[PDB]
Amino acid sequence: NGKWREQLGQKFEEIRWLIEEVRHRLKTTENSFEQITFMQALQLLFEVEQEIRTFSFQLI
Amino acid sequence: DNCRDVSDLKQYDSDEPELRSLSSWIQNEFNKACELTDSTWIEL
């Protein structure tokens, strides 16, 4: 549990980084496979980010 | 009988239909329609 507490900020460091990367790459792309994959990834990431924030708030 | 005294008469909107381009959500709809579920939904 020592180092376990400090990785929350580490994860938050790349959360919006990857969400912005996905947004940009979804905007740029032209194929149909890539667009569906990126949309599904975006929805998954929104769900996971809520989930982790909810548990982080509840535990503390 | 008095309907031909109007000065704002037009036949009909007989214009060419608007043109549209293909999107990607119909393929997703087909993919989701081609997959299996948990209930039975039928009985003969």
Curated annotation (Swiss-Prot), chain A:
Domain of life: Viruses
Intracellular or extracellular location(s): Virion; Host nucleus
Transmembrane segments: none
Sequence motif Nuclear export signal, location on chain: 24-33
Function as written in the Swiss-Prot or TrEMBL entry: Mediates the nuclear export of encapsidated genomic RNAs (ribonucleoproteins, RNPs). Acts as an adapter between viral RNPs complexes and the nuclear export machinery of the cell. Possesses no intrinsic RNA-binding activity, but includes a C-terminal M1-binding domain. This domain is believed to allow recognition of RNPs bound to the protein M1.
Assembly: Interacts with protein M1. May interact with host nucleoporin RAB/HRB and exportin XPO1/CRM1.
Family: Belongs to the influenza viruses NEP family.
Protein name listed in UniProt: Nuclear export protein
Organism: Influenza A virus (strain A/Hong Kong/1/1968 H3N2)
Range covered out of full length: 62 to 121 of 121
From Swiss-Prot, chain B:
Processing after translation: Phosphorylated on serines and threonines by host kinases, including human casein kinase II.
Compartments it resides in: Host cytoplasm; Host nucleus
Disulphide bridges: none
Signal peptide positions (record): none
Function field: Plays an essential role in viral RNA transcription and replication by forming the heterotrimeric polymerase complex together with PB1 and PB2 subunits. The complex transcribes viral mRNAs by using a unique mechanism called cap-snatching. It consists in the hijacking and cleavage of host capped pre-mRNAs. These short capped RNAs are then used as primers for viral mRNAs. The PB2 subunit is responsible for the binding of the 5' cap of cellular pre-mRNAs which are subsequently cleaved after 10-13 nucleotides by the PA subunit that carries the endonuclease activity.
Quaternary structure and interacting proteins, as annotated: Influenza RNA polymerase is composed of three subunits: PB1, PB2 and PA. Interacts (via C-terminus) with PB1 (via N-terminus).
Family: Belongs to the influenza viruses PA family.
Protein name: Polymerase acidic protein
Gene name as annotated: PA
Complete-protein stretch covered: 382 to 425 of 716
